[PDB]
């Protein structure tokens, strides 16, 4: 039950559990959850130091840290046995040198579609992507839609969220551009055909979750994230060099965190403005952000004044 103002040091009733939560998306979401005040239970994988910058968001006693692998069961069960809701955002890009990378979007959402669901949770929310389709593209883009249906058997009502491409501060897609200081700046691939997708802004992403976390009645009715106005152009790549004026890796360097001349280069150039009959963002309001105002912030190059 709630009490008083939710400025800080309140209760607000809810008890969530956010896995992953070390990347760009999962950190910034929880930084709202420790503001209204709740028992945020965040288990991390293998990183005691990489959560140090996380702690000064929850006040005192509100956050807690645990260890878990994911291919084990009870480490994903012992933590979640006392909560109310649970979301998940776990996953990444290219296949590890040790992992399997296919079932990580299949059995790992199923590993928390285990007794976890049976224990008595509700409003379990997974993430999707707007472009994850069952078609033969790509090795990473498809095999995400396999988890969208084969794991949808479990949790018959979820409201699995479907975001478009996101832009914020430290993502990969927008920082894939302007990290291309090279002997040639080529677009993908010297063509202005499909560019671009829908870059929804990161405040709208974290605002959609907190409205849905006690909405109510948002289970099963899956939602889609609208982007900006409206599709986007080829001008974006020229918009980079115009205004820019042309975490547990290793001790020295990681040997392979590459630009990946593989199916990475096509997972973004496959836009797929999908079905507008999903409700999915404006009804889970209110999210309305342009691009031209937030572009000064993330871009940072040598001029810095003019």
């Amino acid at each position: 039950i709630p009490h008083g103002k939710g400025g800080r040091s309140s209760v607000s009733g809810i008890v969530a559990t956010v896995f992953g939560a070390t990347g760009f998306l999962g950190r910034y979401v929880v930084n709202h959850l420790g503001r209204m005040g709740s028992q945020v239970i965040v288990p991390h994988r293998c990183e005691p130091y990489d959560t140090m910058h996380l702690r000064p968001m929850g006040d005192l006693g509100q956050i807690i840290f645990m260890d878990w692998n994911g291919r084990d069961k009870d480490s994903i069960r012992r933590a979640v046995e006392h909560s109310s809701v649970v979301i998940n955002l776990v996953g990444r890009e290219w296949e590890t040198q040790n992992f399997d990378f296919e079932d990580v979007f299949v059995k790992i959402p199923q590993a928390i579609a285990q007794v976890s669901k049976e224990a008595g949770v509700e409003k379990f929310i997974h993430i999707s992507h707007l472009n994850a389709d069952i078609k033969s593209s790509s090795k990473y883009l498809r095999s995400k839609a396999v988890g969208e249906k084969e794991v949808r058997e479990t949790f018959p009502e979820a409201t699995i969220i479907k975001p478009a491409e996101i832009f914020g501060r430290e993502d990969r897609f927008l920082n894939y551009f302007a990290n291309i200081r090279w002997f040639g700046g080529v677009p993908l691939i010297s063509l202005g055909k499909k560019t671009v997708k829908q870059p929804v802004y990161i405040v709208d992403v974290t605002k959609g979750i907190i409205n849905a976390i006690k909405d109510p009645d948002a289970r099963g009715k899956t939602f889609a994230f609208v982007g900006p106005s409206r599709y986007l152009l080829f001008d974006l790549v020229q918009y980079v060099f115009a205004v820019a004026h042309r975490i547990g890796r290793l001790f020295e360097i990681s040997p392979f965190e590459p630009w990946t001349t593989r199916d990475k280069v096509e997972r973004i150039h496959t836009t797929d403005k999908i079905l507008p009959h999903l409700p999915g963002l404006e009804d889970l309001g209110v999210e309305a952000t342009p691009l031209e105002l937030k572009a000064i912030e993330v871009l940072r190059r040598h001029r810095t004044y003019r």
Partner: protein, 152 residues
């Protein structure tokens, strides 16, 4: 692997063998650290050198009492530190702001601004439990860099 994990018993040993601290003298907990610099409990040459420029630091120390006129200036210096950093705050007015705690203009905690790792209690910690806090910090470094990229 026995070959690769043998290496971080040098590197995670080397960082806990040479710490170059900054001190923020603000209140009466500054004076007692000077007696630790005085050669009774001689702070130098037990792994750790004396004062140093603000660029080249690893372990920052907040001592004393924070005011709202110093809350911007703390974060800016905290950004300029390099990556394997640690924050250790001595003094009972850096853990909840001692008393002065119900005052209109004192930062409540020195924890709602920076993330701090080791809490030494006390109006002045007597430069006797504070070397004990530093040997706690080198005891805290049992971490690993290998079997982090070698696992994931």
């Amino acid at each position: 692997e026995y070959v690769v994990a043998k290496l971080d018993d040098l590197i995670n040993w080397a960082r806990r063998s040479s710490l170059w601290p900054m001190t923020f003298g603000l209140a009466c907990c500054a004076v007692e650290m000077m007696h630790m610099a005085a050669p009774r409990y001689d702070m130098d040459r037990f792994g750790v050198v004396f004062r140093a420029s603000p660029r080249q630091s690893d372990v920052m120390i907040v001592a004393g009492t924070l005011t709202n006129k110093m809350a911007p200036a703390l974060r800016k210096v905290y950004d300029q530190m390099p990556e394997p950093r640690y924050v250790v705050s001595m003094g009972s007015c850096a853990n909840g702001g001692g008393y002065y705690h119900y005052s209109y203009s004192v930062v409540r905690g020195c924890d709602r601004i920076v993330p701090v790792d080791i809490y030494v209690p006390g109006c002045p910690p007597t430069a006797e439990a504070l070397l004990y806090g530093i040997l706690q910090l080198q005891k805290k470094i049992k971490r690993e860099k290998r079997l982090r990229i070698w696992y994931r």
